[PDB]
């Protein structure tokens with residue numbers, strides 16, 4: 001039959017210890033504990049308009065329909081006249097952004113884990129592109145790639161997501177199935193370098209202009225050191241992913257076929273050991 | 280108004296490297312990779328009657344509706360004239376049963392990990408009991424507690440499960456269910472807890488399963504002495520209390536899962552986070 005799973009509704013009073021965590025353009029994120037299920041959860045609520053209410057409902061429906069191993073799992077919706085929020089699993093280790101840039105907190109991030117994150121991000125986006133109809137993310141950034149208790153990836157933020165900061169935006173989009181792979185390429189560069197794309201650029205309009213002229217985050221010995229595993233191969237993947245001509249950018253299938261033999265070179269235990277080193 | 284998510288249908292041909300993994304009373308389990316999704320998967324299938332299709336589709340529907348952090352995630356349903364099967368995430372570490380009893384492979388299983396497993400099983404079952412209407416598992420056993428890459432729990436096998444509106448072991452079955460109840464699962468859980476804490480097969484001495492059933496109806500339980508549960512077991516007294524109330528002869532005396540959670544929460548807080556990762560590395 002047309003087997004359908006319903007998203008549970010969660011009474012606001014069931015969400016005990018509601019406390020602020022972070023705020024983004026998407027909304028405010030708070031932690032809480034479910035009174036009956038006795039688990040820690042996360043809540044994404046608005047900062048009560050008629051259309052801003054449909055936005056939250058659209059995202060919730062997207063998360064519920066796009067369930068998969070690498071997508072942030074939705075636990076239910078809290079829809080009341082007094083409060084509106086999305087309830088998801090709690091991700092204790094935050095975002096990929098924090099992992100790459102909080103360098104005193106995380107001085108070392110072993111290569112196996114960086115490559116694992118890269119593979120999972122790709123698995124997550126590939127799944128969205130393979131849904132019917134294809135779901136396009138259109139807002140991939142390190143800030144919305146979340147990390148669970150053992151540093152596995154959960155993709156989030158489906159606000160700009162369509163059913164078929166600007167440093168991750170392809171140049172043609174300043175004024176398409178090939179958008180996400182562009183963003184993925186920038187992310188890949190960021191993960192392998194632990195540097196902010198276009199560091200010396202003061203103004204975001206200079207970035208937008210340079211990008212439209214074909215400039216891309218710098219690739220040299222200083223940004224991507226020679227000790228990077230599979231360096232040459234990764235540089236090629238990055239460079240094809242952020243290509244100026246969208247048609248020259250690979251699909252996520254191609255991207256995964258290229259990545260698979262790279263991930264096989266890391267022994268399973270090195271992933272575990274990479275994690276145990278972290279704070 | 281009502282937000283619905285549909286379970287994907289997976290064409291058989293999309294499952295590459297289909298290879299036998301294990302058998303049980305539940306059916307055959309094979310491993311595979313999804314050709315488009317590029318992930319490894321598990322496939323529970325029969326190994327033709329139309330009578331069996333309703334069973335597989337019933338379980339698929341339950342797994343799809345009972346989605347939660349400690350419930351085995353269903354990825355799709357493979358329903359064709361040639362083949363019928365449930366596609367789920369692959370759990371590389373197998374079952375709690377194999378962890379407890381492969382003693383040469385796993386000489387040590389750290390107390391913190393054991394407690395986290397127990398805590399997660401209870402969280403899973405608790406969630407099932409809090410659904411509207413409540414879902415009752417009715418076939419909990421260590422063989423059905425599956426373990427992911429970091430030894431987190433995923434509850435499987437909802438074949439005998441029911442909404443409150445096949446030859447296997449009977450050791451996890453409450454005695455009132457023998458001859459022709461929201462208190463079934465807790466009894467199973469209590470046996471599971473004893474098994475987890477002792478790494479001993481319940482009713483080890485008794486060879487004939489009928490004898491067990493007699494013994495059990497006559498009030499008997501798995502042995503709670505020093506030989507089975509050493510004195511050096513973290514929170515021994517609090518645990519034995521839980522086990523004993525869990526497998527009471529009178530269903531009314533047995534506690535809810537919510538109650539167990541309330542008891543287990545302080546116990547889990549006594550272990551530092553680092554110990555779980557250490558336990559998983561010790562097992563690799």
Ligand SMILES: COCCNC(=O)c1ccc2c(c1)nc(-c1cnc(-c3ccc(Cl)cc3)[nH]1)n2CCOC
Pocket residue numbers: 020021022029042043044072086088089090091092093094095146156157
């Ligand atoms: C009080 O201390 C604040 C410091 N910040 C953190 O340590 C922290 C921890 C976890 C965070 C965190 C900060 N910010 C987020 C976060 C960012 N975006 C989300 C989110 C996105 C979409 C949805 Cl639907 C739900 C959550 N969570 N998460 C993950 C929440 O689990 C989902």
Ligand SMILES: COCCNC(=O)c1ccc2c(c1)nc(-c1cnc(-c3ccc(Cl)cc3)[nH]1)n2CCOC
Pocket residue numbers: 299300301308320321322323351365367368369370371372373374425435436
């Ligand atoms: C060739 O033999 C290799 C040795 N077998 C194993 O080590 C092994 C590994 C993992 C196993 C394994 C053996 N047996 C199972 C298993 C047992 N029951 C299930 C299962 C039950 C219900 C559903 Cl709906 C799906 C899977 N999987 N799993 C987990 C599969 O991921 C779900």
Ligand SMILES: [Ca+2]
Pocket residue numbers: 383384385386561562563
């Ligand atoms: Ca060993």
